[PDB]
PDB file of C-alpha atoms and ligand atoms in Angstrom:
ATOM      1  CA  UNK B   1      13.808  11.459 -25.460  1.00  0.00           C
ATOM      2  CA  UNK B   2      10.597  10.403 -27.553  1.00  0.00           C
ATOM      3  CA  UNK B   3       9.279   7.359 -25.205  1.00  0.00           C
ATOM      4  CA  UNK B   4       7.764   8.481 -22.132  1.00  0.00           C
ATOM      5  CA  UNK B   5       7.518   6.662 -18.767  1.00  0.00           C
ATOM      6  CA  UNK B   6       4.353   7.123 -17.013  1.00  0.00           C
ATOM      7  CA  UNK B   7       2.185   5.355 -14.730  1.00  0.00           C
ATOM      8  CA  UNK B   8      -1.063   5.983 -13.085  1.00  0.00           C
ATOM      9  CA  UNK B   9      -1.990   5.015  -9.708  1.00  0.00           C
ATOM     10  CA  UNK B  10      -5.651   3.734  -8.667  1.00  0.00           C
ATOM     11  CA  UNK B  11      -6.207   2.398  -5.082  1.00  0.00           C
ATOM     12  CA  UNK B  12      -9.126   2.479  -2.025  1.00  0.00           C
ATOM     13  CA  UNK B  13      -9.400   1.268   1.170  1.00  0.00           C
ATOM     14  CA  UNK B  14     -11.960  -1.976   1.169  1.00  0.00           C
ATOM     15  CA  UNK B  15     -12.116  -1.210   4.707  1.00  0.00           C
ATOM     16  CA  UNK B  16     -13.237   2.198   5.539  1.00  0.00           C
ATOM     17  CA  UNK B  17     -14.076   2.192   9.246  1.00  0.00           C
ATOM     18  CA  UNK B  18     -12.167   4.795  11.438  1.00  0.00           C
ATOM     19  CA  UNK B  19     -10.755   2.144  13.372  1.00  0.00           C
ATOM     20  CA  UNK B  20     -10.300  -0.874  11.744  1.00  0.00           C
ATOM     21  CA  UNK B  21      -7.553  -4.358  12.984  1.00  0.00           C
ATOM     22  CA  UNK B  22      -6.028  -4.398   9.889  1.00  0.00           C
ATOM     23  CA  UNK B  23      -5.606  -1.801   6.784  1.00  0.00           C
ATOM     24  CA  UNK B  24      -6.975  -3.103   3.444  1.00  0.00           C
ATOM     25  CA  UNK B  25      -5.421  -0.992   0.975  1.00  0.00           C
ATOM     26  CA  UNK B  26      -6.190  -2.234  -3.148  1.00  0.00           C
ATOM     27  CA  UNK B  27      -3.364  -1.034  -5.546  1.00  0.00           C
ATOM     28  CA  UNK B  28      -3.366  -1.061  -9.360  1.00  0.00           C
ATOM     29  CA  UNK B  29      -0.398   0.013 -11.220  1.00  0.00           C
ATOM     30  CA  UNK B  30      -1.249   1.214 -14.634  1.00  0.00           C
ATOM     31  CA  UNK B  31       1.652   1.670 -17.101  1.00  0.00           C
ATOM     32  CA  UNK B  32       0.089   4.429 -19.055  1.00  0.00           C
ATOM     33  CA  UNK B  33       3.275   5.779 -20.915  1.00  0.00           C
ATOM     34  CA  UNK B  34       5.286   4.038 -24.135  1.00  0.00           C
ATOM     35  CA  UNK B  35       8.050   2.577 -21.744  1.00  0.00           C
ATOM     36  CA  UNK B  36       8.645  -1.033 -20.483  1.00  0.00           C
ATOM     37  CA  UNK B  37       9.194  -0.899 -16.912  1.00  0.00           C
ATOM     38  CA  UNK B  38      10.764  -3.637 -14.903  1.00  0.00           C
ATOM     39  CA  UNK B  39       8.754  -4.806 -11.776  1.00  0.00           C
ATOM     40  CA  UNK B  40      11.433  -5.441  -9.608  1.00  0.00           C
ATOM     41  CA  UNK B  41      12.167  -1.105  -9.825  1.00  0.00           C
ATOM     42  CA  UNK B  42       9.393   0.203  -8.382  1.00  0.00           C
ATOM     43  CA  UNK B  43       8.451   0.479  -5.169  1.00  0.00           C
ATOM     44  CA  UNK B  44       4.635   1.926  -4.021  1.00  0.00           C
ATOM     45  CA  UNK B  45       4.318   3.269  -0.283  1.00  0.00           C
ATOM     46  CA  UNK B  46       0.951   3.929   1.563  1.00  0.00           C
ATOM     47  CA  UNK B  47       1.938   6.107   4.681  1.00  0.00           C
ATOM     48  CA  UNK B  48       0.186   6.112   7.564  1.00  0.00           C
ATOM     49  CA  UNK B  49       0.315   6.113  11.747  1.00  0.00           C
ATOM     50  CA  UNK B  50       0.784   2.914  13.311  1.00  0.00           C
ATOM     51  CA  UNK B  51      -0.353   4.725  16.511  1.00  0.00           C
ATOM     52  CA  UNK B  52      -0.192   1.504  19.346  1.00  0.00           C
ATOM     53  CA  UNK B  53      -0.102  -1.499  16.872  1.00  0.00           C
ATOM     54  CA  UNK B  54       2.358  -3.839  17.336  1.00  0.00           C
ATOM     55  CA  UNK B  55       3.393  -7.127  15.687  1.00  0.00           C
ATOM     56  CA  UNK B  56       2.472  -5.451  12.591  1.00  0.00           C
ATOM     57  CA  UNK B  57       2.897  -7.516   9.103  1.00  0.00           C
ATOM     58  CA  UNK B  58       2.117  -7.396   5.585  1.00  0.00           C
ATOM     59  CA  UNK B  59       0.736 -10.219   3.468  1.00  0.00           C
ATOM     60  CA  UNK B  60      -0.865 -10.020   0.049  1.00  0.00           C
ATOM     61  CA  UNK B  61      -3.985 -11.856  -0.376  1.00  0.00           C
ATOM     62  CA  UNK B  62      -3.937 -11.825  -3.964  1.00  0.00           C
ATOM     63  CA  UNK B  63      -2.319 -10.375  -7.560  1.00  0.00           C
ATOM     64  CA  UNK B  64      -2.910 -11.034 -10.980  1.00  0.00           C
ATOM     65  CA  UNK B  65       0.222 -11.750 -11.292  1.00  0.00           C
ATOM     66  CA  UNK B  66      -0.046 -13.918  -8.564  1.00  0.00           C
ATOM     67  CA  UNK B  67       0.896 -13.373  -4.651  1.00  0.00           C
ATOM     68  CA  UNK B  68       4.572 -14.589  -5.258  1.00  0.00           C
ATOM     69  CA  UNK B  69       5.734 -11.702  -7.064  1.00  0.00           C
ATOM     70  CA  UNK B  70       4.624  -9.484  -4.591  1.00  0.00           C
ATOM     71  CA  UNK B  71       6.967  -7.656  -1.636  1.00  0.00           C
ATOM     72  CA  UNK B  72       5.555  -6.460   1.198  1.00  0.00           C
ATOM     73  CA  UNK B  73       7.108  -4.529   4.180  1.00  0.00           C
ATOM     74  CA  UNK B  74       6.085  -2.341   6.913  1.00  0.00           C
ATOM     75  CA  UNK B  75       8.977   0.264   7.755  1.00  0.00           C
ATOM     76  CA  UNK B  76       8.951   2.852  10.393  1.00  0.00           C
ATOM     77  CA  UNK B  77       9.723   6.830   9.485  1.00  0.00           C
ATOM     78  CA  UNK B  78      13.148   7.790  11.014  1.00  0.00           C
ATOM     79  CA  UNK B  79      11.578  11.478  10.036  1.00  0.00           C
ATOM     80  CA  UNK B  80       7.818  11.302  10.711  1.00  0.00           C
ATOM     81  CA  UNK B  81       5.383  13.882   9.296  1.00  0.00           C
ATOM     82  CA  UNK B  82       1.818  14.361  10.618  1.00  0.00           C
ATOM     83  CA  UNK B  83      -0.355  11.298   9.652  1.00  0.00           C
ATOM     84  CA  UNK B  84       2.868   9.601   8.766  1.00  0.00           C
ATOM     85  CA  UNK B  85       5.210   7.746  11.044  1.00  0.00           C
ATOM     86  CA  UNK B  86       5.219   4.754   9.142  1.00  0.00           C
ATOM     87  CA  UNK B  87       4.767   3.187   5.757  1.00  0.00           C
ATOM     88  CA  UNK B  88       3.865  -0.053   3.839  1.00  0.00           C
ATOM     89  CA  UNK B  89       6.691  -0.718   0.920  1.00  0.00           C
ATOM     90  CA  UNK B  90       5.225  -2.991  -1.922  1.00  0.00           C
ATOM     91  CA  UNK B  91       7.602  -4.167  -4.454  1.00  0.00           C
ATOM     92  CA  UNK B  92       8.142  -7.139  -6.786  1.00  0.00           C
ATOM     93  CA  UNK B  93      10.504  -9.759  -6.878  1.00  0.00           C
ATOM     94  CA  UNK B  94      13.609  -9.902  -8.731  1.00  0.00           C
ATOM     95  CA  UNK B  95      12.047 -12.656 -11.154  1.00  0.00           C
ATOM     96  CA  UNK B  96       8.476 -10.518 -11.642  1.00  0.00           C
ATOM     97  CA  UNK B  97       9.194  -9.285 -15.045  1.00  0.00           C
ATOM     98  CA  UNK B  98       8.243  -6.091 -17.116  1.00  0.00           C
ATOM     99  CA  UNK B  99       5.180  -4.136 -16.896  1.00  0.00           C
ATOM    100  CA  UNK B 100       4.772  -3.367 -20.739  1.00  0.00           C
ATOM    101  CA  UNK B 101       2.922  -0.241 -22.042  1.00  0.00           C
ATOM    102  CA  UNK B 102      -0.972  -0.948 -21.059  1.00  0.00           C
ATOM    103  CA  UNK B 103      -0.436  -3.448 -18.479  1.00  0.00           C
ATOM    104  CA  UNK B 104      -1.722  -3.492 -14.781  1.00  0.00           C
ATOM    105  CA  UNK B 105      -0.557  -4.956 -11.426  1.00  0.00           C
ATOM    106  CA  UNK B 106      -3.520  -5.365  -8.826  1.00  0.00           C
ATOM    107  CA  UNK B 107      -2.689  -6.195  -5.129  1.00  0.00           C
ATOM    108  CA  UNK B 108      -5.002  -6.865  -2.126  1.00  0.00           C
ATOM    109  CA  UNK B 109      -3.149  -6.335   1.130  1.00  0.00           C
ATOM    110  CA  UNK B 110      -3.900  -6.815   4.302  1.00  0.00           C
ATOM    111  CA  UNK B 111      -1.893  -4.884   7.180  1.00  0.00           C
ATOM    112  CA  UNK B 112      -1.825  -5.534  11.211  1.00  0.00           C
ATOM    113  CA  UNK B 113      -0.934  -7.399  14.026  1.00  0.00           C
ATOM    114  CA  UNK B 114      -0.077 -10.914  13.183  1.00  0.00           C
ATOM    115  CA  UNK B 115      -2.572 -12.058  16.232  1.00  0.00           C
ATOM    116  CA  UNK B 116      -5.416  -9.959  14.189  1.00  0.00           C
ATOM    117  CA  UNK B 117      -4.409 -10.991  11.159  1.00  0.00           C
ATOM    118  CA  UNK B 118      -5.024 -14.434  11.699  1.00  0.00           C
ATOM    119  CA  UNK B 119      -8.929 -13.678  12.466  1.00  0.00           C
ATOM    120  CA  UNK B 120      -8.916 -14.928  16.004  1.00  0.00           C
ATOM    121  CA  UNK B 121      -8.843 -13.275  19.165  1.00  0.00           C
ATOM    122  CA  UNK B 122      -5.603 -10.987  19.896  1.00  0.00           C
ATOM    123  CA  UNK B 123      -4.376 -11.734  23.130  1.00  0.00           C
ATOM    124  CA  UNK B 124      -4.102  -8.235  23.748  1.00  0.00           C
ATOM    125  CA  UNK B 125      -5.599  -4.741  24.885  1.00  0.00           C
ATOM    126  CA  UNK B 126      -7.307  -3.096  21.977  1.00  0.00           C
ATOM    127  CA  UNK B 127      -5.131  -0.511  21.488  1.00  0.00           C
ATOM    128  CA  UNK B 128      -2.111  -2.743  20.349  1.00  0.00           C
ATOM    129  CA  UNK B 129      -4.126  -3.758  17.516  1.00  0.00           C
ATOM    130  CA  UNK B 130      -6.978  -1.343  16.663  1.00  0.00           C
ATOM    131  CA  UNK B 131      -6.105   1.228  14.067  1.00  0.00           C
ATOM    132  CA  UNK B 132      -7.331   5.014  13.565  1.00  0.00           C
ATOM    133  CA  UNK B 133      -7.479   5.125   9.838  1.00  0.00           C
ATOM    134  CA  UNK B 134      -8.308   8.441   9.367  1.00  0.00           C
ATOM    135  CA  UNK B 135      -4.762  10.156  11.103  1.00  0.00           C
ATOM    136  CA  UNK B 136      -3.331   8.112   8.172  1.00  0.00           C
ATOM    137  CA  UNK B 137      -1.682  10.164   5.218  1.00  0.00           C
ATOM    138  CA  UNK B 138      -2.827   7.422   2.197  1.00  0.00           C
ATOM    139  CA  UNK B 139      -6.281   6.185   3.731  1.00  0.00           C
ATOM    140  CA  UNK B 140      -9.524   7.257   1.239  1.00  0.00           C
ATOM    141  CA  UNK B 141     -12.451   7.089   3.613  1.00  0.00           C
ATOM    142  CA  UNK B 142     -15.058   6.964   0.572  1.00  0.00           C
ATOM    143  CA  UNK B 143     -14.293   5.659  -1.945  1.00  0.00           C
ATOM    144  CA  UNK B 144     -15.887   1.585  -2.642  1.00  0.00           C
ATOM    145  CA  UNK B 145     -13.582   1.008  -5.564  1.00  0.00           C
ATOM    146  CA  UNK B 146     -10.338   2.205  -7.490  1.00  0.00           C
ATOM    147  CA  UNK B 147     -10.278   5.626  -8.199  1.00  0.00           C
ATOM    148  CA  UNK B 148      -6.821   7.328  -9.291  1.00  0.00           C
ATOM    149  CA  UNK B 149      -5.306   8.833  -5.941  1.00  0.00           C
ATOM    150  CA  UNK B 150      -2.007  10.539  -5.196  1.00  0.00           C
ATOM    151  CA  UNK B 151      -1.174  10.452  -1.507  1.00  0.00           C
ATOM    152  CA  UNK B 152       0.262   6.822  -2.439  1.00  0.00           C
ATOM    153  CA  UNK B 153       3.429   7.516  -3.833  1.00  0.00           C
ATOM    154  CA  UNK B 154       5.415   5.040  -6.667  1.00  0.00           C
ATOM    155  CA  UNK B 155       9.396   4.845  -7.195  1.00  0.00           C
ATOM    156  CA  UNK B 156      11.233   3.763 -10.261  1.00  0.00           C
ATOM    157  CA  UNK B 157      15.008   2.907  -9.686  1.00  0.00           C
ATOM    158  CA  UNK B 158      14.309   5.297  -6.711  1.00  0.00           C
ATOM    159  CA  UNK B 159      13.069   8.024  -8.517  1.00  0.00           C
ATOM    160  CA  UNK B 160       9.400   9.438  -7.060  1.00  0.00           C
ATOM    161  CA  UNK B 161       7.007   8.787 -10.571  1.00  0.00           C
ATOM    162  CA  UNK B 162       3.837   9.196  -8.560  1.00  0.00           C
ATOM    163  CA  UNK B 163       1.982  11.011  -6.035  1.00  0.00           C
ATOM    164  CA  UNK B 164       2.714  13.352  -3.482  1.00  0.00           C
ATOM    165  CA  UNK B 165       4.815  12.646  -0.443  1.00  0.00           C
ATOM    166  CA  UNK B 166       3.334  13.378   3.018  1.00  0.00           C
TER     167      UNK B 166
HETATM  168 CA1   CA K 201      -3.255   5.679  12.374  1.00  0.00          CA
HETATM  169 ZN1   ZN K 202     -15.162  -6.560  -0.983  1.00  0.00          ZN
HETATM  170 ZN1   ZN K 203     -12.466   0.826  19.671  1.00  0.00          ZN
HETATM  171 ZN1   ZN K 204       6.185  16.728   3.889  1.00  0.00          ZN
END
């Protein structure tokens, strides 16, 4: 047909260090085709190795369209590849609405140990809460702000819109 759906993806890492106790990936969603899309469809993955981290948990910090409306999980890979054994699943809530033609979603995530997370001192070995960012499949080790980058991949009603699977 005559009305396209198409999104871009822009993200970075606000946290760039090789190892790092918690992964800060930024995410905007950029409906760049002529298509309304509805939120609670898509699903965006950033892929990476949880190497020894354990109690790991997602929380968003902060949307535009407001932290409520945001889905966060961390799933592990019953088929890892290299760099990827596990991945972070953002999606919306049932009640998030449409992304109309020229609208954004921004989210600020944090990923990690819940003990890290909480910005006091794990009660554990480092290694169960220190991350190697760079043996992970979606981590951008330069770049300060968004740029548009496809090893984070985005699903519509399951189908793969964006990026390139690891
Ligand atoms: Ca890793
Ligand atoms: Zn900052
Ligand atoms: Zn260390
Ligand atoms: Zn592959």
């Amino acid at each position: 047909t005559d009305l396209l759906t198409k999104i871009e993806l822009q993200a970075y890492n606000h946290i760039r260090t090789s190892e790092t106790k918690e992964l800060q990936p930024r995410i905007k969603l950029i409906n760049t085709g002529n298509t309304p899309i509805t939120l609670s469809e898509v699903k965006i993955r950033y892929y990476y190795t949880k190497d020894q981290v354990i109690n790991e948990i997602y929380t968003c910090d902060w949307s535009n369209i407001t932290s409520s409306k945001i889905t966060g999980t961390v799933v592990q890979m019953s088929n890892p590849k290299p760099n990827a054994d596990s991945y972070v699943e953002i999606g919306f809530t049932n009640s998030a609405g449409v992304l109309n033609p020229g609208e954004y979603v921004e989210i600020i995530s944090r990923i990690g140990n819940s003990y890290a997370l909480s910005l006091a001192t794990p009660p554990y070995s480092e290694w169960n809460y220190m991350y190697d960012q760079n043996s992970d499949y979606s981590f951008n080790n330069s770049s300060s702000d968004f740029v548009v980058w496809d090893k984070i991949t985005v699903y519509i009603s399951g189908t793969l819109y964006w990026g390139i699977e690891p």
